[PDB]
Write a protein that binds this ligand. Sequence first.
Ligand code: ZN
Lengths: 56, 49, 187
Amino acid sequence: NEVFSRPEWMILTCLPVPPPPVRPSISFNESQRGEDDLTFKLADILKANISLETLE
Amino acid sequence: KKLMAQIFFGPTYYQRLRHMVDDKIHARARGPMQVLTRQPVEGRSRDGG
Amino acid sequence: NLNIVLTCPECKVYPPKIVERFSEGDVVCALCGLVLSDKLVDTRSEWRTFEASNPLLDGNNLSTRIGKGETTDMRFTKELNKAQGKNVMDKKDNEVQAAFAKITMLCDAAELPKIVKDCAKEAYKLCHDEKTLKGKSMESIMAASILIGCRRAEVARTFKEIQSLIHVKTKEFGKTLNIMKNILRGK
Ligand SMILES: [Zn+2]
């Protein structure tokens, strides 16, 4: 559409971060974290992104 | 009064199966919703929809 | 500024428990007997093994470790297991991890209890940081996490016997016995 979809956007330059309601928390005990899966992979994305900026 | 058709009458072994009605009469009318979906919860032990 | 409250509104008491209810929810005051929101949050329903995580040191993530029988990893297993084995060199990754893995090996071998066996290993991670006359020997402060780890019950000790086991039972054990007394009196 040029307006809503340019081919240059099928490639991810800037990645949107989904808020806390998509990826909730709270646990089973009540003295520790109890996190979500998406968050984990987002942390993995960040580490992989930080170590890259490091080398360059 | 007598019954116009005689009946098949005699002892027969019957087992009492589990799953009794009282163990199944779930009924909810708005209650605890899930965190992720804000949709009612599953199972009757949690009072679900 | 974060203020969170359930005050009834109609007859402020400042403040009282409103009930969690059983089915209806919403915490209606036994005072104005009104409502507050809809609740809709089951805390009993935590993520089971069937996602939850109980981290004690920093934050656990994980990477790779592919094994799903769909397409064989072979070439790609080594592509990613090498690539993740390169990354655990960027910012002092080794230290805490090496300490906790070597920690679970020394305790498991003597069969130290997990509930309090792991408790003392948290104490070591608090003792490895902070700089108070450690004269750190690695093995030395490990005999502190071998004592408090056996503090669950007298699982293997008889702490003196586990001291008489292996190496360093003397002056270097003295430095360590002191460190524990200083850590206990530390609020
Ligand atoms: Zn009230």
